[PDB]
Design an enzyme around this catalytic site. Structure first.
Site: not given
Ligand code: HEM
Ligand code: HEM
Ligand SMILES: CNCCc1cccc(OCc2ccc3ccc(N)nc3c2)c1
Ligand SMILES: CNCCc1cccc(OCc2ccc3ccc(N)nc3c2)c1
Ligand SMILES: C[C@H](O)[C@H](O)[C@H]1CNc2nc(N)[nH]c(=O)c2N1
Ligand SMILES: C[C@H](O)[C@H](O)[C@H]1CNc2nc(N)[nH]c(=O)c2N1
Ligand SMILES: [Zn+2]
Lengths: 411, 407
Positions: B283, B109, B278, B106
């Protein structure tokens, strides 16, 4: 044990058995993955099984495993080792070894070409002047007026580690970098430390932005000597953009021949510490890394300004936009000048085909995803969705420490 | 045994000790790296709990306290007695935030401690789950001012009474296999878009139809629910320069809400723990739009830009890829929906990584996932060496429910 890799874009699944023939360590464990770590005097003791493993490989590849030729060769090598503490490879073996070192280079996306490698045997070389001659010839042959040909020149192997042959340049052709008193850099920042040594060794630097560095050549463990590559041998390409006429005025150019000269070639336990090799460029090596890395020429901004991009917020992707136009210009310039180059779409597409062929014909293809995926536009290339297994096979190319950090100076 | 990671752009060296507290396995060995592989009892439970309570009580400066030891015995007694145990709210929130903190893949983070944890362990039915999920969505969405959130359903008991959200994300677009041959809507969800139908859904067989929820409570057959459209914040996609971009007819939803992961805390398994943050722009624009096995509109955009699509060397794909990603960011920023570009997010991540090395001794990171899918080397993470290892509490993958459900 079998290992499966999946292409998540095609669902094609492949099976690796080749990793079983792996010996060397990765760096990883059950508890940690070091897959993103850049870089993670041999007794006769460990030398014979290394030679034997190599000769078994070699003789298998020529369909003569267990032959008398095979057995006699093992015997001869065995006797040479215990008598002289090392051994000599035949030409056939040397060529095989060099090609397979390339075939085994898990970070190389250009491996589809591995079987077409011109191997120059420079093992009779004794001096730096001899090395310069061999290297000039390599460069002339490799460059081929722009129609690039992969080649490797192999200087004598290490003996006691006290008589090493070394090319001190990281690449045969590279631009000087000069640190200015005000903190700025003239030329290629990647080469500032090497440029300094050259200067100290007596190089008279033109101090321009694109000065080709001299060759700094070490034969037989002696202090390195300076040689200028004849300029007519250094093929260079002025960078222009097919739509942007102001691009030429950035005053950029690059050399045509990427020739890595600082790696160590390991074959059958023998160490070749000077083995310059060359192929041709993937465009992103120049356009993304060499021009746009913040730690390199770093011209992203000046390009961005000239495009009149919104450089106020990163979310305008002005960096991404400039990066693409620069890479377009590199490819345009090289193709226009008929200098061999490959774009990242072509190269990765080829690598996938190579890889599948290797799984079939070989039982695998060691591949380092971290290096195989291009430094721009990763996911729109087919390697991105390709699971890959990384493991180390011999023969291989290895890193070695910079020679200035280990060299014993004579005077 | 103490590991160093180098940033090659800054020479900054960090020393990792945190990997020594790692417990789970990587898939790698000394002889093979699997860094690029996407998916590699009463007695098992107590050390797992102990390990967790130990870190919990250390985090609040009460390691070796009466409360620590008391909690340890109580859990131990509850375990030997009940064959499982229940977390206290404080521990549950701690565990959830740390599962995020430990998610090596991730990039987002740095926000880990600002996570709203919604305790849904009193939930018993799919209608109940639906209620919790609607509340989560409304809260997380916040009219565009997105807020991180996780809703946690009852923990696995015996693998028979599993709570499962069958959607991979709370909000996703339908995908149907045409008779034509290609695909309408989102190709990734074709198999799911079908199961909705095979369970009873009625598709508007469109392109961007918000999928219904398929909710499984207590191991029972899953049930369809339509998310109230007014809870689904969507962003029409336009370009700040190509006026023709609108006619492509694209939009995307504001809330990325992953719902198929398993949350592991102190040995306990939460099979239903939908969480949302979000989007990073890439992506949607790189992956969702331009992936070949997704919306794959690269070609179409290139044509409208009239780029030379004859040879790959014109880099028309790259050129279009960038414009698309500019549009996504532009569209969200315009509509005041939270989004982050890959430059900001990676810069944030380097800082987070620095902070973690400082205040924790490390930060597990999966370079393969952290580096964005475009322009990778002009982001600071590309030159960042990372160590990947598995810490717990953690999010894990779990099999698709349909492959496993005992109907
Ligand atoms: C012929 C065309 C070739 C192409 C297009 C190509 C492409 C590349 C690229 C893009 C990389 C990554 C380098 C970086 O990003 O810094 C690489 C790595 C590498 N290549 Fe190739 N290459 C070619 C030929 C060769 C040849 C002829 C050899 C050896 C005989 C070779 C051996 C290697 C090795 C050992 C590495 C890894 C370097 C490292 O670990 O730092 N390549 N190649
Ligand atoms: C708040 C803003 C957030 C951003 C910008 C962000 C960013 C990302 C990105 C870009 C990925 C890679 C996804 C892909 O490429 O498919 C990812 C993965 C992941 N994220 Fe975050 N994230 C955020 C919030 C969260 C939260 C709130 C959680 C959990 C509490 C979380 C847990 C994870 C996990 C477990 C993965 C790995 C998924 C996998 O292994 O497949 N993220 N994140
Ligand atoms: C920009 N990354 C450089 C990191 C690095 C460090 C040490 C060696 C090294 O070699 C890269 C390399 C090696 C062989 C190559 C062969 C052909 C080619 N086009 N590029 C090639 C590039 C690369
Ligand atoms: C495109 N890669 C999909 C592979 C995959 C498989 C299973 C789960 C998964 O989650 C990705 C994921 C998880 C959490 C996220 C949180 C926020 C965000 N913007 N993206 C996030 C993305 C991703
Ligand atoms: C094969 C490879 O592991 C796969 O394509 C991965 C690569 N890196 C990724 N990185 C992110 N952030 N998200 C992904 O889905 C993937 N997919
Ligand atoms: C830390 C990381 O491993 C390092 O920056 C790598 C990343 N991937 C790379 N990939 C290629 N092809 N060349 C590189 O120099 C690098 N650098
Ligand atoms: Zn690994």
């Amino acid at each position: 044990r079998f290992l499966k890799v999946k292409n998540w874009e095609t669902d094609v699944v492949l099976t690796d058995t080749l990793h079983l023939k792996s010996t060397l360590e990765t760096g990883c464990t059950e508890h940690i993955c070091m897959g993103s770590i850049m870089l993670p005097v041999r007794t006769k003791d460990q030398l014979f099984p290394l030679a034997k493993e190599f000769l078994d490989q070699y003789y298998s590849s020529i369909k003569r495993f267990g032959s008398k030729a095979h057995m006699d060769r093992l015997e001869e090598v065995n006797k040479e080792i215990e008598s002289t503490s090392t051994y000599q490879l035949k030409d056939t073996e040397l060529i095989y070894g060099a090609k397979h070192a390339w075939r085994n280079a898990s970070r190389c996306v250009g491996r589809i070409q591995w079987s077409k490698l011109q191997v120059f045997d420079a093992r009779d070389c004794t001096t730096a002047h001899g090395m310069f001659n061999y290297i000039c010839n390599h460069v002339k042959y490799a460059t081929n007026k722009g129609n690039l040909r992969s080649a490797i020149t192999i200087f004598p192997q290490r003996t006691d580690g006290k008589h090493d042959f070394r090319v001190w340049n990281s690449q045969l052709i590279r631009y000087a970098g000069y640190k200015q008193p005000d903190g700025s850099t003239l030329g290629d920042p990647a080469n500032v430390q090497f440029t300094e040594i050259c200067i100290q060794q007596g190089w008279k630097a033109p101090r321009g932005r694109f000065d080709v560095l001299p060759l700094l050549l070490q034969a037989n463990g002696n202090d390195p000597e300076l040689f200028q590559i004849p300029p007519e041998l250094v093929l260079e390409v002025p960078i222009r953009h097919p739509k942007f006429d102001w691009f030429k005025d950035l005053g950029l150019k690059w050399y045509g021949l990427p020739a890595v000269s600082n790696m160590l070639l390991e074959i059958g336990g023998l160490e070749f510490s000077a083995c310059p090799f060359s192929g041709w460029y993937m465009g992103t090596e120049i356009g993304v890394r060499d021009y746009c890395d913040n730690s390199r020429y770093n011209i992203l901004e000046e390009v961005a300004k000239k495009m009149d991009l919104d450089m106020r917020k990163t979310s305008s992707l002005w960096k991404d936009q400039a990066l693409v136009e620069i890479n377009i210009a590199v490819l345009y310039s090289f193709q226009s000048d008929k200098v061999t180059i490959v774009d990242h779409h072509s190269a990765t597409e080829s690598f996938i085909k190579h890889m599948e062929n290797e799984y079939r014909c070989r039982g695998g293809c060691p591949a380092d995803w971290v290096w195989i995926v291009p430094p721009m536009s990763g996911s729109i290339t087919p390697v991105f969705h390709q699971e890959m297994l990384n493991y180390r096979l011999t023969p291989s190319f290895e890193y070695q420490p910079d020679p200035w950090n280990t060299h014993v100076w004579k005077g």
